[PDB]
């Protein structure tokens, strides 16, 4: 599959370069996810004056070396072909018309049309199985002349057919055989969007990516990584090409050969993905989408889940689907870091940490949850307590998902603690920057740093004199976020305040030999981006609230998470949105397990569920992933 692609001259001094095979991509257990497969083609080249009777002889020689699909043969092909495949039949067909042509009373055109109008009935079926074989090669040999090469066979070129034809090129004028490599995907559709694509050789480096690939020393004939993993790890997955140099003189005789570089295959790239976990998640996600639709969520259009190991940032799984009104799924794994959503209450753990670090609230501070009244008549209240007055902890705020605790916390951060009937503070610019700085430190707002292109950090709108938006940011209902951000954030809680870069790459192998990993080259680490600016008591208080949400009778997550095979903890979020001016919610979920020494963390996002008086338990998808992963 070694195409050249360079021949550089100098001192009567050619340097030719030969391409090398691409590195594989394996999962964390070694299972091949992306491989190379060989593809052969049989090609012809049509000359200035190669006859119609010559190509009919080269084709007949070929039907003994290859088998041919007899599609593509039009009836004009069969009709035309039948004329040579019995001249004295066609001469019996045009008895009269031949004399008119000889008298010059009809032209060759008229004659031709009249003959090709003159059979299709019983005596077109005169074409044997082998005749159609030579016609299927003939039809491809007249595609569009000049030295451009038409392909005869592309798919199902067997190696037997490839060897037979290659060793007969001396008896087959214009016939040629090529060999080329394509990516092969043992697991089908799974993660194809994360894996990405290489250019198709006919493509070369794509126009949009060019100049960038040329500033590194590559050629426009080269095949290169176009998107996502193939692009990100392009220069570890590409080989070192075989570079030959020759020294020649007078008319062309080489007087010295010198192998500049023998070549090496690309390095194998091993990912953090566990493809068995990945398939199990995709299976549960599909069943959960279908169950939620059966319970009324037939406008829900996105469902995304990220599964991480919070101690090192490893992405163990990453799945997303888009859902049309009929339940049909379109794969969208990349939505976890390229798409942003209003996530609602699940951010409140970050809000509390921002409150503590600016001394706006104390660990364990109790406040009264109740409807708040602001100037002119604007009210704000917590879902669990629309009509009453309850004194609650910060960890009971997380358990209940108290809006009003976070509102009071944000006004304290704004230097304007709540009093009934107050007017909202006029300039919240400084409070807004302080609240975002707190959320940034757990991954809410900045790019997480994933080793894939196109990560978005979410839509971040100005906070100057819009205190209503500012209070909303404290409950996840202003700036938007990616599921990976949600996941980085809950992982920072799970691992005691260390915000780690998520990564899907895990290691790079100095692969030399076919189908053998070879020694380890380099590791791909989830680096620590920062530690949260909070004490150990402060982090443990959010952790305690998260455990209470999943395990106390009144936690919003009690229904889905109280019975996990190991103890789990996390936070739910619900945000009121609109679609085509109809009311909807987004539902989010974050969590980790086991509580005591977390080894797995996750985020889940559903968009445009029905507004709940019936509360759907889409968190069950998280309960099921936890239960599967800790089966043994």
Resolution in Å, one decimal place: 2.5
Look up residue 151 and give its two tokens. 């392909």
Q: Find the angle CA(131)-CA(135)-CA(137) to the nearest 5 degrees.
A: 125
> Is 578 a domain residue?
yes
H/E segment holding residue 151: strand 149-153
Same domain? 341 vs 246: no
Domain membership of residue 152 (yes or no) is no
571 DSSP β-pair partners: 590
450: Cβ contacts below 8 Å, ≥ 6 apart: 315, 337, 484, 501, 502, 503, 504
The total of other beta-carbon atoms located within 10 Å of residue 160's CB is 11
Say how far apart CA 405 and CA 401 lie, in whole Å: 9
The Cα 403–Cα 566 span in angstroms is 29
Question: Does any domain span residue 143?
Answer: no
- Residue 65, preceding bond cis, omega within 30 degrees? no
Q: Tell whether 213 and 280 lie within a shared domain.
A: no
What are the backbone angles phi and psi of residue 311, rounded to the nearest 5°? Answer: -80, -20
Q: Which domain holds residue 496?
A: 275-629
Of residues 575, 385, 397, 543, the one with CA closest to residue 476: 575
3-state secondary structure of 416: coil
Determine, yes or no, domain membership for 439: yes
Alpha-carbon span 211 to 207, nearest angstrom: 8
Q: Are 594 and 276 in contact (CB under 8 A)?
A: no
Between CA 229 and CA 232, with CA 231 as vertex, the angle to 5 degrees is 65
* Residue 318 and residue 407 in one domain: yes
102: Cβ contacts below 8 Å, ≥ 6 apart: none
Domain CATH code at residue 573: 3.40.710.10
CB contact set of 522 (below 8 Å; sequence gap of 6+): 507, 508
Chain-centroid distance, C-alpha 407: 38
- The strand ranges marked E within 379-459 are 379-380, 390-392
Residues noted as catalytic = 345
Distance CA 428, CA 411 (A): 9
Residues 472 and 554 in one domain: yes
CATH number of the structural domain spanning residue 267: 3.90.1310.10
As to burial, measured by CB atoms within 10 angstroms (0-12 exposed, 13-18 middle, 19+ buried), residue 130 is exposed
Choose one of 271, 305, 326: the last residue of a domain: 271
Total number of domains in the chain: 2
Whether residue 222 is found in the same domain as residue 327: no
Rounded CA gap, 315 and 306, in Å? 7
**Do 235 and 339 lie in a common domain?**
no
Burial (0-12, 13-18, 19+ Cβ within 10 Å), 488:
buried
CB atoms within 10 A of CB 180: 17
CA dihedral for 418, 424, 427, 429, sign (positive or negative) = positive
Neighbours of 481 (CB within 10 A): 28
The answer to whether position 346 is within a domain reads yes
Whether 375 maps to a domain, the answer reads yes
Residue 609: strand, helix, or coil: strand
Q: How many CB atoms lie within 10 A of CB 620?
A: 19
The answer to whether the beta carbons of residues 593 and 563 sit under 8 Å apart is: no
**Does 134 reside within a domain?**
no
Pairing of strands 268-271, 25-26: parallel
Domain end call among 237, 271, 305: 271
* Domain end marker among 271, 295, 320: 271
* Cα separation, 524 vs 589, whole angstroms: 28
Q: 137 lies in a domain?
A: no
Residue given tokens 């019936």 in the structure block: 614
Report the 3 state secondary structure along 472-526.
HHCCCCCCCECHHHHHHHHHHHHCCCEEECCECEEEEECCCCCCCCCCEEEECCC
Give me 581's structure tokens: 């001016």
Claim to verify: residue 229 and residue 375 sit in the same structural domain = no
Burial of 526 (0-12, 13-18, 19+ CB in 10 A): buried
Q: Which of these, 310, 413, 393, 357, lies nearest to 538 by C-alpha position?
A: 357
In order of 335, 402, 574, 582, the CA distances from 299 in angstroms are 18, 28, 16, 10
Distance CA 408, CA 369 (A): 9
Q: Is residue 262 domain-shared with residue 372, that is, in the same domain?
A: no
Based on DSSP, count helices (H) and strands (E) in the chain, helices before strands.
21, 23
470, 410 in Cβ contact below 8 A? yes
Residues 317 and 256 in one domain: no
For residue 202, give both structure tokens.
Answer: 């006919």
Is residue 392 domain-shared with residue 365, that is, in the same domain? yes
Residues 617 and 558: beta-carbon distance below 8 Å = no
Residue 59: enclosing H or E segment and its boundaries?
Answer: helix 52-62
Alpha helices in 569-608 (DSSP H): none
Tokens of 331: 């794969």
d(CA 75, CA 428): 77
Alpha helix (H) ranges present in 85-158?
A: 87-93, 95-103, 108-116, 129-141
Query: 536: which residues sit within 8 A by CB, 6+ positions away?
Result: 496
Alpha-carbon span 471 to 477, nearest angstrom: 9
Per the DSSP assignment, residues forming a β-bridge with 551 are none
d(CA 367, CA 411): 13
61: left (phi over 0), alpha (psi -120 to 50) or beta: alpha
Q: Which helix (H) or strand (E) holds 236?
A: helix 234-237
- Structure method: X-ray
| Contact of 618 with 288, CB cutoff 8 Å | yes
Cβ atoms of 281 and 317 within 8 Å: the answer is yes
Phi, then psi, of 16 in degrees rounded to 5: -100, 145
Range list of H helices, 552-619: 558-561
Question: Under 8 Å CB-to-CB from 481, ≥6 apart: which residues?
Answer: 340, 341, 343, 347, 444, 445, 458
Contact in structure between 127 and 78 (CB atoms under 8 Å): yes
Residues in the chain: 632
Q: Which residue has the tokens 């998808």?
A: 621
- Separation between Cα atoms, residue 529 and residue 504, nearest integer Å: 16
Distance CA 292, CA 300 (A): 9
Query: Do residues 447 and 543 share a domain?
Result: yes
CA-nearest of 554, 591, 600 to 570 is: 591
What span, in angstroms and rounded, lies between the C-alpha atoms of 196 and 143?
Answer: 33
Measure Cα distances from 584 to 286, 487, 577 in Å.
Answer: 21, 23, 5
Residues 558 and 624 in one domain: yes
- CA torsion sign, 459 to 464 to 468 to 470? positive
**Cα dihedral across residues 271, 507, 482, 230: positive or negative:** negative
Q: How many CB atoms lie within 10 A of CB 58?
A: 19
């Amino acid at each position: 599959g070694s195409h050249y692609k360079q021949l550089i001259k100098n001192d009567e001094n050619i340097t030719v370069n030969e391409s090398v095979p691409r590195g594989r991509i394996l999962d964390r257990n070694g299972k091949v996810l992306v491989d190379n497969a060989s593809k052969m083609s049989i090609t012809y080249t049509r000359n200035r004056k190669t006859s119609q009777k010559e190509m009919l002889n080269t084709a007949k020689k070929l039907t003994d070396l290859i088998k041919m699909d007899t599609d593509k043969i039009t009836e004009r092909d069969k009709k035309d072909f039948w004329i040579q495949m019995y001249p004295s039949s066609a001469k019996k067909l045009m008895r009269k018309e031949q004399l008119m042509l000889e008298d010059g009373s009809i032209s060759q055109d008229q004659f031709d049309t009249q003959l090709r109008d003159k059979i299709g009935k019983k005596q077109l079926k005169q074409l044997t199985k082998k005749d159609l074989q030579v016609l299927a090669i003939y039809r491809e040999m007249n595609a569009g002349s000049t030295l451009d090469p038409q392909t005869i066979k592309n798919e199902d070129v067997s190696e037997k057919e490839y060897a037979a034809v290659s060793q007969q090129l001396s008896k087959l004028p214009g016939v040629n055989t090529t060999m080329d490599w394509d990516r092969k995907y043992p697991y089908g559709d799974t993660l194809r969007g994360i894996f990405g694509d290489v250019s198709t050789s006919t493509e070369g480096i794509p126009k949009e990516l060019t100049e960038q690939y040329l500033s590194k020393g590559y050629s426009r004939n080269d095949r290169v990584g176009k998107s996502y993993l193939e692009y990100q790890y392009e220069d570890v997955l590409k080989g070192t090409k075989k570079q030959m140099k020759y020294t020649t003189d007078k008319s062309g005789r080489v007087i010295s050969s010198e192998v500049l570089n023998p070549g090496s295959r690309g390095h194998d790239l091993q990912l953090t993905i566990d493809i068995d976990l990945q398939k199990k998640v995709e299976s549960l996600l599909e069943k959960q989408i279908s169950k939620l639709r059966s319970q009324g969520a037939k406008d829900m259009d996105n469902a995304l889940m990220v599964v991480q190991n919070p101690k090192n940032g490893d992405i163990l799984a990453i799945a997303g689907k888009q859902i049309d009104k009929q339940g049909k799924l379109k794969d969208y794994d990349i939505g976890n870091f390229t798409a942003q959503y209003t996530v609602g209450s699940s951010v409140k753990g970050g809000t509390l940490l921002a409150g503590y670090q600016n001394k706006a609230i104390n660990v364990g501070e109790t406040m009264v949850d109740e409807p708040l009244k602001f100037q002119g008549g604007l009210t704000k209240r917590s879902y669990f307590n629309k009509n009453g007055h309850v004194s609650i902890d910060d960890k009971q705020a997380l358990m209940h998902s108290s809006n009003v605790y976070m509102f009071k916390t944000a006004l304290k951060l704004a230097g304007d603690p709540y009093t009934s009937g107050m007017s909202l503070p006029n300039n919240i610019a400084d409070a807004g920057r302080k609240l975002r700085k707190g959320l940034n430190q757990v991954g809410l707002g900045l790019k997480t740093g994933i080793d894939l292109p196109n990560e978005t950090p979410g839509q971040i709108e100005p906070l100057t004199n819009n205190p209503g938006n500012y209070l909303d940011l404290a409950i996840g209902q202003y700036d938007t976020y990616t599921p990976l951000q949600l996941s980085q954030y809950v992982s920072t809680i799970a691992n005691d305040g260390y915000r780690i870069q998520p990564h899907i790459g895990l290691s790079i192998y100095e692969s030399t030999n076919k189908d053998e990993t070879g020694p380890l080259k380099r590791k791909i680490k989830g680096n620590v981006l920062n530690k949260v600016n909070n004490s150990n008591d402060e982090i443990k208080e959010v952790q305690e609230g998260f455990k209470m949400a999943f395990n106390e009778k009144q936690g919003t997550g009690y229904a889905s998470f109280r019975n996990t095979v190991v103890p789990s903890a996390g936070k739910t979020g619900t945000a009121e949105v609109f679609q085509d001016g109809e009311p909807r919610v987004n539902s989010t979920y974050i969590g980790y397990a086991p509580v005591d020494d977390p080894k797995l963390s996750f985020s889940i996002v559903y968009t445009n569920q029905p507004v709940p008086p019936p509360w759907l338990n889409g968190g069950d998808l998280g309960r099921d992933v936890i239960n599967y992963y800790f089966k043994d």
